[PDB]
Design a protein around this nucleic acid. Structure first.
Ligand SMILES: [Mg+2]
Ligand SMILES: [Zn+2]
Lengths: 49, 147, 49, 98, 91, 97, 1095
DNA sequence: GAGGGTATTCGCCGCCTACCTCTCCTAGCCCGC
DNA sequence: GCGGGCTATGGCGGCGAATACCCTC
RNA sequence: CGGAGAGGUA
């Protein structure tokens, strides 16, 4: 619900997510960029980092 | 029934009552995130959020006085409607009815406007930043350089 | 978008007359307008992709 | 789960807020439509900028002036009621309107 | 459409524009000629049932597959009868 | 002159349509107030010299410098990721000569 | 042969033109100057209208007053009226206002008479209506000491328009009509896809037309009497399902005023008040004229109405019903014949021009309406026999409206003062975007087009290049605006196949019913075309070969469609439209050079352009110069009177350039009225001079002029050929402050006297001092509660120069200061800028580029005689961009500089047969002119290149092809092949590299989102956007991206720790949590959403 | 008059990036000094 | 009498949902 | 350095 709210239609996404009580398992490029964490790709994968 | 069941199952599966749609209290954002500045000389120009909070507070206090002192049902109902409208405009100004406009006939920036659009929080502050150790200048061709 | 059946009959070495220049300005400007519209249109598609 | 934050994030959850949650977030109530005074250039009380709700406006100081040093750390003012802490607290604390 | 709008509608999986019907079962067709409407009936080789489209406007041409589409001609399962762009959701 | 030795720099031109819009070079001080761009990276940057401008970034930490030196160095990026054709190829005056 | 034989003291610039100009170019500021004297009703406008509009000469203010008055109460027992507006002398001269800060305005008075309708007592007074901003002689307004230009607005003329569309479902051609009023309510009449004519009064339900037809008083008898020949008209009543006059009225009320008693009287009031009274509906004079012209109602009675009428509203229906069918003619009863047809909404007959006068009139009108409401309110709450005109009038709304228009409008624009041409071009702009026009994004590609109706009224070339493409235009050269706002262009009447005199001004609407010919057409002074066929714009701008007996008019000159700036490009017809647009726009960006020099290959539109711009000084009256100095000229008139002109030296323009006037006459010369007596910023002998003549080569060179880069010699720097002066303006004031009182003085604590060496007794720096980046210009201290806090003015980063002037306004000297201040000290610093690497240059043909390198003058290609070239331009840029005009300009510039002599020993050569005398021979450094579309042919250029004079010895350095044999200054060997050389005209654009260089490591930060600030003026940092993030993610570089987004931008502790680590030899710490995520969390919580982070 | 099937119209959502310069943020009116 | 503070009918395409018009029971 | 409007460069 955090990657969809930054793309389009923030109000609708937020209001539906709040009703469905969705939990965000932060795993993605955009989400890790937003929360200031190493992206899971390239030199940020476990075998490399 | 498909859409009705969508919403009803959404509210049934989790321990989330549908009573959160009707509000009894209204949170207030911290002041340093809605600051008020002064133009040249020392004259303060109000922010949009402060004006909407002020309207809601005024309406709430006046309705409270009217109810406490006792009054005909019409006045109390009218004031409750005017409080409902103010609270609606606080969260989302312009969704229903005429936008609450400030000086110069321009709609105010509600709390919802902070999150939406190309100038909203996300696409202006979280997906892009202003970074130190950077500069800018015009480019010219150096033929003696190496790749 | 239709062709002018005249047509323009002088090269830019010789020098176009006044009417030839005026009827050339049409296509000259339509291209720039379309270019602005297209640069506006492409970024949205790239972001969606 | 983690209050402010601090890394080792695992999930970010969202949901509707009940009146109890909204009253628990708030450090006080706003019940006067006054933002700031012009003569003293200070926030009013029970307004939208109150220092007894959102936090001190000067590091380790009180609107009373009773305590204006770090030695008076953590004590809630006995005269004005403003807690003595750093001014950054105004970016965090919230209030509510009943 | 033949440019960036065409790309946008391809990636958006929208109904194209000049949507051309596509057969759903191999069989011959009793092509009919009329103004503002063309009746194309799918006569399957098995003969179970015959699908038909009579709303085809005369403006659009008939696709040339294998000779132009003609009366009483067998067609494949996915052959596009008319000319234009097929709708992705039907293929 | 000693401090800036062997310290890569990131140059960027807007719009950044593709990946090669940011590349890492090595700084050598010159005379003037303009940036001197190697002629073979213009196609990658889609840049010209009729008034264009560019930004400059400096990676600080060891990981950032290693990334600049190995991943983003200009001499290691000669082929287009989209198609594989070379992009540091000679053009215009070089082709004529 | 010469260019300007009318101006008394003009240079003898010879021309290649072959065609005579019947008419002289009008004044280039007449629109702005005339539309305002119409507003104030000056005697000059009255005289102008006498020989034209003597029937009813009324000014804007008079018209507004007459329309407003009389103001009477409901009972009609009293009245108030206005008349005879009057202006007094301006309070201060233009220079005084521009210096102090006052607005250039004069008092306005009106005679107000109050009449009591039951006692007969009449009381009259002269009521002051406020200060009225006045227009300077140059067409500008000084508002708060700043010059401004009120741009003209293109808008859609009010009237009735019919349009056509194709129905997708049934392929039926649905029609429509819309009555567009001024300040009124809309009224549509559609034909939908069921053959049911309907109405959409305002934005209500689609009521059938028969509803309103009957409600107006008609019956089925009359409805079928006039309507009925259309099947749909009768079918409308057949299936109306409603009938009755009162029934119809109550239906209209049900659709108009929901929720109130539907009474017949109330419906009458509502309807005939919305659409017929006087004040809710105003078609206006232009709207009434257009409606009468379209619906063929009257061709007689002078327009004396501004309201709708039954005949018009029924003629609209008749027109629509006839239109839908196939009819192509109608004659409404008691009306002249008129065809049936749709209306093109882009035509220049269907869109008029709102000039400065009309806009100001509209604003005054709204202010007067507010005042009228106030006066009517107060006219019933005050006792009789105590009311006087002064006791009811409140001027506040009018002054407020004037202030708001002149300060907060999209048409009142800051004037452009880069050079003389930019301001003149600004004063002649036509914009479509404004309060009442299109939108910069919602506007389509059909309003950004070149319409055939624009030929001779709007220039098709000079438009912006970005989002405003097609929305801002420029008025043409010979064009004028008529009383109703429709632009007219001159034409030369041709009679019986003879191109005669007596120019007549036409409009687009009128011009659409004639055939006009091309100006550059063959005529033989006998009124008979030499050639058989001539291209002519047939009806809809369709150029066609046509018989010579059909032509009805002729263009005045072959220079009629272009604007002023586009008319200064020589060999314009050899350049493509894109590059011509680039060059026309770039001519307005050139900076004034320290010394100006006129071109050698100009066009001719440079003397009038300079004189009309008004930056030169023109002698008021003829006389003999008495004493001429650098600061003042004194003409001793022919009647014993002396008038001393004062020259403004080293002044500052709105854009930081330097304005400097220099006399060009001697102490014994005799001058004539209208003669140029001094020069301006970009003028040389009274002609525009925006650049310099340089010797150019057209070869590639070592890859330094690669991809539009340029190579310059070092002579242009040593000799100051392209040097310019710029001026900055630093201002600081001392307020009263809540703290209380602040002073400017040398007493700055903690600073030694050494730093304050350049400071003086008062506090300001000494004139003639040198200031560098960081230096006290005005030393002060403010007690922030000693508490004295030094907030002294400093030289901005990257600034330097010399302090050349200081202005200080003191409250003690009863100055016109703002509220709450005491001092307004101001400073000026000026510095000369030489051409450097990174500066932008360009010609007049869209050939732009930055300076790649500045070679030493030793290793430069030099001619056989030893003369180095000045500039080198690459070969690969020309043939691709279709701007070959620069090469022809170079050839002709070489011919002009070298001087020539055609050898007509035995007859003039056939290539010089049509070459005017005085052009068969020239001396070195001769100045010539090639008009924009009628100039030098290629054969003439070849011939002139074939015969040029030797330099000192009998050597011709450039051969017939125009190419010389150069030498390699870097190696010494001669280049294997010859090169093209010559003189072209180069300008220095206002895009210097000193203004575009910026760097940062740390500094000011934002407060809410704790990120660096944006801008070169508060240090600020470059922004790492979203596509750069995509690129960094595609590289697979996680750590650089993380550091960029965390420790360089908004990680408060991280920034300080990183700085402390780098300054020392430590290693960079780990990044933390950004600061823009916590703000988002708080906002989401404030929206009543329980957001939490779960471990 | 309710049902089910069509049409029809209205509201909302979306519409590239980076940088530079310049001017202005209510009106009325009631109380206080 | 003047100043300061308090209050009160020139986008357009896609799409879905809230609702006109007509045959059936 | 917060907002609105105007103009401009790539
Ligand atoms: Mg460029
Ligand atoms: Zn206290």
């Amino acid at each position: 619900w955090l990657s969809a709210a930054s793309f389009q239609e923030t109000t609708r996404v937020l209001t539906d997510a709040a009703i469905n009580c969705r939990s965000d398992k932060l795993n993605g490029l955009k989400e890790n960029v937003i929360i200031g964490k190493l992206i899971p790709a390239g030199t940020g994968i476990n075998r490399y980092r | 029934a498909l859409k009705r069941l969508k919403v009803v199952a959404a509210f049934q599966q989790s321990g989330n009552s549908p009573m959160g749609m009707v509000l009894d209290a209204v949170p207030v954002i911290p002041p340093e995130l809605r600051p008020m500045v002064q133009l040249d000389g020392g004259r303060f120009a109000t922010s949009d959020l402060n004006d909407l909070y002020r309207r809601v507070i005024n309406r709430n206090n006046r309705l409270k006085r009217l109810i406490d002192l006792g009054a005909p049902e019409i006045i109390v109902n009218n004031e409750k409607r005017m409080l409902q409208e103010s609270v609606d405009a606080l969260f989302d100004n312009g969704r229903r009815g005429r936008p609450v406009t400030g000086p110069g006939n321009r709609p105010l920036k509600s709390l919802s406007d902070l999150l939406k659009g190309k100038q909203g929080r996300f696409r202006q502050n979280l997906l892009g930043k202003r970074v130190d150790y950077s500069g800018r200048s015009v480019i010219v061709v150096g033929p003696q350089l190496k790749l | 978008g239709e062709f002018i059946p005249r047509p323009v009959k002088s090269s830019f070495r010789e020098g176009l007359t006044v009417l030839e220049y005026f009827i050339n300005t049409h296509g000259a400007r339509k291209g720039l307008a379309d270019t602005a519209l297209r640069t506006a249109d492409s970024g949205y598609l790239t972001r969606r992709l | 789960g983690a209050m402010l934050d601090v890394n080792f994030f695992d999930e970010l959850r969202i949901g509707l807020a009940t009146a109890e949650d909204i009253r628990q977030w708030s450090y006080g109530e706003v019940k006067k439509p006054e933002t700031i005074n012009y003569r003293t250039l200070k926030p009013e009380k029970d307004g939208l900028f109150c220092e007894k709700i959102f936090g001190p406006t000067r590091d380790w100081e009180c609107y009373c002036g009773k305590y204006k040093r770090v030695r008076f750390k953590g004590i809630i003012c006995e005269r004005c009621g403003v807690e003595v802490t750093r001014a950054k607290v105004r970016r965090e604390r919230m209030g509510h309107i009943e | 459409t033949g440019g960036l709008p065409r790309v946008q509608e391809l990636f958006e999986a929208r109904v194209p524009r000049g949507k051309a019907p596509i057969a759903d079962v191999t069989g011959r067709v009793r092509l009919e000629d009329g103004e503002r409407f063309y009746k194309i009936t799918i006569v399957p080789d098995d003969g179970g049932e015959e699908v038909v489209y009579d709303k085809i406007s005369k403006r659009q041409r008939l696709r040339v597959f294998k000779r132009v589409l003609s009366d009483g001609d067998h067609v494949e399962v996915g052959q596009q009868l008319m000319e234009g762009s097929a709708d992705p959701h039907e293929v | 002159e000693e401090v800036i030795a062997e310290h890569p720099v990131l140059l960027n031109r807007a719009p950044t349509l593709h990946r090669l819009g940011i590349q890492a070079f090595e700084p050598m001080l010159v005379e003037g107030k303009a940036i001197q761009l190697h002629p073979l990276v213009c196609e990658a940057f889609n840049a010209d010299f009729d008034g264009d401008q560019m930004a400059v970034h400096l990676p600080l930490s060891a990981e950032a410098q290693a990334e600049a030196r190995i991943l983003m160095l200009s001499s290691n990026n000669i082929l287009s990721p989209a198609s594989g054709r070379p992009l540091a190829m000679p053009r215009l005056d070089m082709v004529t000569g | 042969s010469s260019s300007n034989n009318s101006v008394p003291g003009a240079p003898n610039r010879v021309s290649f033109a072959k065609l005579r100009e019947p008419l002289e170019v009008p004044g280039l500021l007449d629109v702005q100057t005339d539309s305002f004297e119409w507003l104030i009703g000056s005697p000059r406008w009255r005289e102008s209208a006498a020989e034209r509009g003597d029937v009813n000469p009324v000014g804007g203010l008079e018209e507004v007053l007459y329309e407003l008055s009389p103001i009477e109460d409901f009972s009609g027992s009293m009245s108030l009226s206005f008349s005879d507006p009057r202006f007094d002398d301006v309070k201060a001269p233009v220079d005084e206002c521009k210096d102090k800060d006052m607005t250039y305005a004069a008092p306005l008075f009106v005679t107000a008479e109050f009449i009591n309708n039951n006692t007969g007592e009449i009381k009259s007074q002269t009521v002051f209506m406020g200060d009225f901003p006045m227009m300077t002689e140059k067409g500008t307004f000084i508002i708060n000491g700043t010059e401004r230009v009120v741009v003209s607005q293109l808008v859609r003329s009010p009237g009735v328009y019919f349009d056509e569309t194709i129905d997708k479902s049934t392929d039926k051609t649905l029609h429509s009509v819309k009555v567009i009023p001024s300040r009124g309510a809309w009224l549509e009449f559609d034909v939908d896809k069921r053959d049911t004519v309907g109405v959409r009064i305002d934005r209500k339900r689609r009521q059938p037309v028969t509803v309103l037809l009957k409600a107006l008083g008609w019956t089925s008898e009359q409805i079928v009497e006039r309507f009925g020949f259309s099947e749909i008209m009768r079918s409308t009543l057949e299936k109306d399902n409603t009938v009755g006059t009162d029934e119809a009225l109550l239906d209209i009320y049900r659709k108009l005023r929901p929720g109130e008693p539907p009474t017949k009287e109330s419906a009458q009031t509502l309807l005939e008040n919305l659409f017929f009274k006087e004040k809710r509906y105003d078609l206006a004079r232009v709207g009434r004229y257009k409606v009468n012209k379209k619906l063929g109602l009257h061709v007689g009675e002078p327009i004396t109405s501004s309201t709708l009428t039954e005949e018009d509203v029924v003629a609209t229906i008749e027109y629509l019903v006839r239109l839908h069918e196939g009819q192509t003619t109608m004659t409404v009863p008691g009306g002249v014949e008129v065809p049936v047809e749709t209306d093109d909404i882009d035509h220049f007959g269907n869109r008029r021009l709102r000039t400065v006068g009309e806009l100001i009139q509209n604003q005054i009108r709204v202010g007067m309406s507010r005042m009228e409401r106030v006066v009517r309110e107060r006219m019933t709450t005050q006792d009789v026999e105590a009311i006087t005109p002064q006791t009811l009038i409140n001027i506040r709304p009018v002054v407020a409206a004037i202030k708001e228009f002149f300060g907060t409008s999209q048409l009142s624009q800051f004037m452009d003062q880069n050079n003389p041409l930019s301001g003149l071009t600004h004063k002649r702009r036509l914009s479509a975007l404004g309060p009442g026009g299109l939108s910069r994004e919602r506007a389509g590609l059909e309003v950004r087009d070149v319409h055939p109706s624009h030929y001779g009224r709007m220039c098709p070339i000079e438009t912006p290049e970005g989002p405003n493409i097609g929305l801002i235009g420029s008025l043409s050269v010979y064009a004028r605006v008529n009383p109703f706002g429709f632009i007219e262009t001159p034409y030369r009447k041709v009679v019986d196949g003879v191109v005669s005199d007596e120019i007549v001004y036409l409009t687009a609407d009128e011009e659409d019913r004639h055939v006009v010919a091309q100006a550059n057409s063959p005529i033989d002074a006998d009124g008979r075309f030499v050639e058989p066929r001539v291209l002519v714009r047939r009806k809809a701008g369709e150029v066609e070969y046509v018989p010579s007996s059909e032509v009805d008019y002729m263009d005045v000159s072959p220079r009629q469609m272009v604007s002023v700036a586009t008319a200064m490009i020589p060999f314009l017809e050899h350049d493509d439209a894109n590059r011509a647009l680039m060059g026309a726009n770039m001519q307005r960006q050139a900076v004034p050079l320290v010394r100006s020099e006129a071109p050698l290959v100009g066009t001719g539109m440079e003397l009038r352009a300079a004189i009309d711009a008004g930056d030169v000084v023109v002698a008021e009256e003829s006389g003999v110069i008495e004493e001429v100095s650098a600061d003042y000229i004194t003409v001793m008139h022919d009647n014993g009177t002396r008038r001393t002109y004062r020259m403004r030296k080293f002044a500052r323009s709105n854009h930081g350039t330097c304005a400097n006037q220099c006399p060009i006459v001697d102490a014994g010369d005799r001058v004539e009225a209208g003669q140029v007596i001094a020069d301006g910023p970009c003028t040389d002998d009274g002609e525009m001079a925006l650049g310099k003549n340089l010797l150019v080569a057209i070869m590639p060179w070592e890859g330094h002029n690669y991809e539009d880069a340029i190579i310059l010699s070092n002579r242009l720097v040593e000799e100051d050929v392209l040097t310019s002066i710029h001026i900055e303006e630093h201002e600081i004031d001392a307020r009263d402050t809540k703290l209380g009182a602040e002073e400017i003085t040398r007493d700055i604590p903690n600073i030694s006297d050494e730093v304050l060496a350049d400071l003086d007794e008062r506090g300001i720096v000494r004139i003639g001092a040198e200031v560098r980046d960081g230096d006290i210009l005005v030393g002060k201290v403010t007690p922030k509660g000693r508490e004295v806090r030094d907030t002294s003015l400093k030289v901005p980063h990257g600034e330097s120069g010399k302090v050349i002037g200081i202005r200080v306004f003191s409250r003690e000297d009863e100055d016109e200061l703002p509220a709450g201040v005491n001092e307004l000290v101001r400073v000026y610093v000026a510095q000369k800028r030489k051409i450097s690497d990174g500066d932008k240059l360009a010609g007049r043909h869209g050939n732009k580029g930055v300076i790649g390198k500045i070679l030493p003058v030793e290793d430069m290609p030099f001619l056989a005689d030893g003369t180095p070239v000045d500039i080198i331009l690459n070969t690969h840029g020309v043939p691709r961009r279709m701007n070959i005009g620069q090469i022809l300009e170079t050839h002709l510039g070489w011919c002009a500089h070298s001087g020539w002599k055609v050898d007509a020993a035995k007859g003039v050569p056939d290539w010089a047969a049509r070459l005017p005398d005085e052009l068969l021979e020239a001396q070195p450094n001769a100045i010539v002119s090639t008009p924009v579309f009628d100039g030098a042919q290629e054969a003439e250029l070849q011939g002139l290149l074939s015969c040029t004079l030797p330099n000192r010895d009998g050597d011709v350095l450039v051969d017939a092809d125009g190419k010389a044999m150069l030498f390699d200054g870097r190696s010494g060997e001669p280049f294997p092949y010859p090169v093209t050389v010559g003189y072209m005209y180069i300008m220095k654009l206002h895009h210097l590299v000193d203004d575009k260089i910026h760097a940062r490591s740390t500094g000011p930060y934002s407060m809410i989102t704790q990120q660096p600030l944006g801008g070169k003026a508060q240090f600020g940092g470059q922004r790492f956007g979203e596509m750069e993030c995509w690129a960094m993610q595609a590289y697979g570089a996680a750590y650089t991206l993380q550091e960029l987004l965390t420790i360089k931008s908004d990680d408060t502790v991280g920034r300080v720790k990183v700085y402390e680590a780098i300054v020392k030899g430590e290693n960079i710490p780990e990044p933390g949590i950004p600061e823009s995520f916590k703000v988002l969390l708080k906002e989401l919580q404030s929206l009543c959403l329980n957001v939490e982070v779960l471990s």
